[PDB]
Every structure is written in C-alpha cells, then in structure tokens.
Amino acid sequence: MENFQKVEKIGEGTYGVVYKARNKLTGEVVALKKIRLPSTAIREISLLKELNHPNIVKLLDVIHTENKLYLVFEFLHQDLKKFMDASALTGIPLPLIKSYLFQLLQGLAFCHSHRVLHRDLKPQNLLINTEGAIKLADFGLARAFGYTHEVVTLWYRAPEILLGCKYYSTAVDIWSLGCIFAEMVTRRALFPGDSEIDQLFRIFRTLGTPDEVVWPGVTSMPDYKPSFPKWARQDFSKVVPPLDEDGRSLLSQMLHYDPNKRISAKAALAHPFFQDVTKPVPHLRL
Numbered sequence: 001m002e003n004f005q006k007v008e009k010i011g012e013g014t015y016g017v018v019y020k021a022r023n024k025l026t027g028e029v030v031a032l033k034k035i036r037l038p039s040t041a042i043r044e045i046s047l048l049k050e051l052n053h054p055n056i057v058k059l060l061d062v063i064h065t066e067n068k069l070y071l072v073f074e075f076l077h078q079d080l081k082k083f084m085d086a087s088a089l090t091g092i093p094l095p096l097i098k099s100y101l102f103q104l105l106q107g108l109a110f111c112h113s114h115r116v117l118h119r120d121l122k123p124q125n126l127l128i129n130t131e132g133a134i135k136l137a138d139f140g141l142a143r144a145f146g147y148t149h150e151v152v153t154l155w156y157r158a159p160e161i162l163l164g165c166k167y168y169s170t171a172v173d174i175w176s177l178g179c180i181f182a183e184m185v186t187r188r189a190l191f192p193g194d195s196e197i198d199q200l201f202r203i204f205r206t207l208g209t210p211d212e213v214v215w216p217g218v219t220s221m222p223d224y225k226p227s228f229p230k231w232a233r234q235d236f237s238k239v240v241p242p243l244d245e246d247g248r249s250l251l252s253q254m255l256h257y258d259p260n261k262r263i264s265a266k267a268a269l270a271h272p273f274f275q276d277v278t279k280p281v282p283h284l285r286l
C-alpha cells in the first residue's frame, strides 16, 4: 500500500471499497479494491491475473498483507449506470447499444471458453472509457470467498439461481446481459425485484410461469413450488419497443428459461442483429 496514494473512493461492493489511486512511485493511475479478512481465494484471485481480454478490466496485481487484501486494477472513468442516467432523456443510440452488447458478448465468450463465469453482471459492474470500450469489471470475485450490508440487486439474477440451482452455468451471465440489453433500450429495468420471490414473480409476469414444457426439470428445482401462480407470457413487442425484429429475436434467446437452450455468447456473436455492427465514440464528460 505504501506504493500507492489514495485519490478518492470510486465505489463500494459487497466485498471491498474501491479507491482511485496513484503509484507514489510511477504516477500510474489505478483502481484499488480493498477486501477485508485466506487460501484457495488467493489461487483463485491469481488465476484471474491471467484472464486478459480487451473487454475485461485488467487486474494488474495482487498485494496480500497483514490479512488485508488489495487488488490493483486498470482504472476506467465511468460505469454504464451513470452513463445510462446521463442518456435518460434521449437514451443511448442504438448503434452504441449494439456496440456495447457486441463487446460484452466477446468479453463473455472469452470468459466462458476458459470456464470463468462472472456471476454478477449489472450496469455498475460495466465500465466505459472515452474510446468507445466497455469492459466487464470485478469479475470472478465470484468463486473468491464470501462490509456495508447495502443490499445486492437481484434485478439481473437468472431464474435458475433464484430457484436454487447450485451448479449453474455460463448461461447465467447471458441472462444478465440480456437484462442489461433491454434496460439500455427501454431506459427502465426489466425485472426490478426487491426480494427473491418478487424478483421471481416479476420474471414470471413478463415471461410466463415456467413449466416442464418450456423448462424440463423446472419443478424438481430446490426452490420451486407448485403453488406458484400461473402467469401467461407476453410478446416482447410489448416488453422492448422499439427494438427491431433482430434485436427482439436476440433478447428472446438470451432470456430463455432453460439455461441449456439459452443462447451462448459465441452464438450470440453470429446473430443477424450484429450484421451492421460499428464502434461509435460516446460523448462522456468527465
């Protein structure tokens, strides 16, 4: 730590608080995550150091000291939520939404081919820079270990996790990214639940209550109950206007109940939604 000069708090997570920091030594500006009070987490964390992609925030180093842990990261100036707020009156132009979705999928297709899942994608875990890039952030702090008790959002949790699946797949990240995708198009959260059952029931009211017809094995799931009310599905023509036909088709596949039929990032890269994909510069104001 004596290597670093704090600059400001940029964030706080379940895990640690995040400082903008400068190398007392090199002048290099970095982001410094502190995690408070072991062994396989170390190996885990260190396995991330290797997981480098243009669309994953780069983990520069791991300092382990006096039982405090610190991860030194590349620093980005803004997150997708703040950018999303700054766009609310007009919303993010479609070619920019498409570019972001496209880069995150490439991010995820890398993750996934290497067996790493993010587990917690959400607008504030996504960071942007002035050159049109969006990066998955704080990534694989999932199979790490466990200070504010500030509630985590459920809004992007995949239904298999809510139904108590222990062993869930890479498909949970796609569900999450599709939640974010629809949110970018609409300027409102897709499934803004405020408890687990409420989060479940909001998915049900838009997507239909899942049964064995749409999701083989649904009813044998840990947290499934037959007494779940039976909601009818809606068309996404009503869920994400005015997303075009390609976009609605893509979102649909990213929001399949059955994780195993849910589109993979790889397949998602090949979807005609991305036929005309470009990389627009965003206006940022820092």
Ligand SMILES: CC(C)c1cnn2c(Nc3ccc(S(=O)(=O)N(C)C)cc3)cc(N[C@H]3CC[C@H](N)CC3)nc12
Binding pocket: 010, 011, 012, 013, 014, 018, 031, 032, 033, 057, 073, 074, 075, 076, 077, 078, 079, 082, 124, 125, 127, 137, 138
């Ligand atoms: C530790 C890594 C992954 C990193 C790199 N940059 N950065 C930032 N930068 C940042 C700066 C300003 C803003 S900003 O001006 O929009 N704004 C103030 C909102 C938002 C984010 C913020 C940040 N913090 C959150 C902490 C919680 C974690 N789950 C995701 C990362 N982390 C980072």
